[PDB]
Structure formats: C-alpha cells, structure tokens
C-alpha cells in the first residue's frame, strides 16, 4: 500500500521546500528522520512534520509498520500566494508576492515478498 | 521501389605511397575515398569510405616555387597572433601536417568529415603499424 500525506496552504515559497524534499526524495524512513532533523533549513521542520504525519497515517489506519516503510513520492506544489504591496523610493507602486507550498510525502511497502 | 541501404559493411583498409606525387592531385583521390564515393556502396550519412594510411610523405613533390613560397597561416586568438610558417619549414619539422591539413580541406565539414579525417593515417617513412590488409594501390 501507499500512505498519502500532505499539508496544503502552508507558508514557504516552492523552490525552497522543493529542494528540501528532493534532499530526501525517496529513501529509508530512519534516514529521512535524521536528514530532516539535521539539515539547516526551515522547510526542514515543515517537511519533517508532514512526513511524521505520513508515518502516522500508515501506522494507525492502514497497517504496514515503519520497518517496511519508504518514501514513495514527495512533491510540494504551490498554492496561490498573498500579494503584499511594498513601497519603493520615488513612490513606486511595487508588489512583493508571498508564495505558498503543498508538501506531499507518500510512502509504503519495502519488499512485497 | 525504394533505394537500397547498405548495412554495416566492412571498413576496407588501403595503402598508398606518397613520393613522386603532386601535393594537389594526391589527396584528391585519397580524400574522395574517405567518402565511399569510389565504392558502388556510397551513402551520404553513414561513413563507410575506407581507411587511408599513407607512407613516406616526407618526400612529397609539388610544382610552383611553392616549396618556399607556399605559406600556411595559424591564428591564435590573442591579437597580433597570426603565425605563418612556409611549406619550406613544414617539411623540415613535422612534414605529415602538410598532407593532413590538405585532405582536411578536401572533404565536407559536417562532424563526420572530421571523424573521417581521423579515418586516415599519415606517416613520413614509409612504415606504419601493419594492422591488416592495406593492399597497395596507385
């Protein structure tokens, strides 16, 4: 089986979290745990969070056990954003967008035999 | 019908002399063989035109006053860096490079015409590495 986990509508620009997830993109769960908690970011904490909540959904809902669990899929697609107006010298109507992400760790079977 | 296409036939190896030959007409044939243009099995985009090993190109002939008057030019990108070395001195020091570069201006230039210039082995001896066949020509 494969446990679909996610956290839509969360602060953080794609590019960043995108690259944090691909740091772990498909690997052993223990690996994932230690890599997530021990690399210097903040999308680190986020993704580690959604991942823990991924292990949660396969442990008490579907039955598989972490022993045979590995990160299938992962992504992080962008939602909309906020659009905050930031002034500039000479009074330039300037906008700074406030991007937002959708981390999607899935995971499952190790063997099958 | 539909014109025929040769498989991976065998790269026939060949041998030609060098001496007593005009610089000009020499490569002329030579080159035209790197292209399977002598073969009734010529195909534009496939390169099956034989290998040309040459021997003793230390003693190539040429007409004109050439010998001295024939200059070759090389340009290194750095300014003022146009070098010219006469055929005169190209004979004394590394003489193959006058047979090489000659054919090199007698083929096309598409990537293969390069790979094909590779399909030719110049020496100023005779002698070579007797790899196989290389049955003489004229």
């Amino acid at each position: 089986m494969e446990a679909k986990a996610i956290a839509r509508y969360v602060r953080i620009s794609p590019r960043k979290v995108r690259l944090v997830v691909d740091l772990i993109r498909g690997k052993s769960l223990e690996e994932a745990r230690n890599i997530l908690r021990y690399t210097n970011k903040r999308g680190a904490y986020f993704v580690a969070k959604v991942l823990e909540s991924a292990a949660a959904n396969a442990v008490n809902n579907h039955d598989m056990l972490e022993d045979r669990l590995y990160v299938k899929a992962a992504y992080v697609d962008e939602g909309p954003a906020l659009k905050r107006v930031l002034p500039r010298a000479r009074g330039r109507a300037d906008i700074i967008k406030k991007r937002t992400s959708h981390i999607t760790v899935i995971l499952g079977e190790k063997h099958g035999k | 019908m539909k014109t025929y296409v040769p498989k991976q036939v065998e790269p026939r190896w060949v041998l030609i002399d060098a001496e007593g030959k005009t610089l000009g007409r020499l490569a002329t044939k030579i080159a035209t063989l790197l292209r399977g243009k002598h073969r009734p099995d010529w195909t534009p985009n496939v390169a099956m035109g034989d290998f040309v090993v040459v021997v003793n190109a230390d003693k190539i002939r040429v007409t004109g006053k050439k010998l001295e008057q024939k200059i070759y030019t090389r340009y290194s990108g750095y300014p003022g860096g146009l070098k010219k070395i006469p055929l005169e001195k190209m004979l004394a020091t590394h003489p193959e490079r006058v047979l090489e570069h000659a054919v090199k201006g007698m083929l096309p230039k598409g990537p293969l015409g390069r790979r094909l210039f590779k399909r030719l082995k110049v020496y100023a001896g005779p002698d070579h590495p007797h790899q196989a066949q290389r049955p003489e020509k004229l």
């Binding site: 690259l19 944090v20 740091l23 230690n34 890599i35 021990y38 690399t39 210097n40 970011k41 | -």
Partner: protein, 59 residues
Amino acid sequence: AKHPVPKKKTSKARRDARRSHHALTPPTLVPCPECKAMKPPHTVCPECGYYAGRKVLEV
C-alpha cells in the same frame, strides 16, 4: 531600473541550469558512542556524549 537591463527572456532551460548548480546538498552523520543516536561528526550529541560526560539534560 537602470543601465543594466536583461535584453530577452531567459529560457526555462537556462533557469534550470543556473539551478543545475544549486542542489540542496545532503549533510552527513555518525552514530553516538555507547547509545543509539545520530550526532554530527566530532560533536557532542545532546543526550549522549563523548568520553567525559557533560550536559545530558533532555526531558
């Protein structure tokens, strides 16, 4: 908004090349002496430790 000005739209490919050098690099690790934990190399894991015994205070 001055002298230097991008003359054309940089290609998504180009984007992905300048990006081809980024790559969120992975860190490295080692296991904790006389316990089960993963500390970074030449460090003192919070709960764990070296040969001396300092800190150790996580509830």
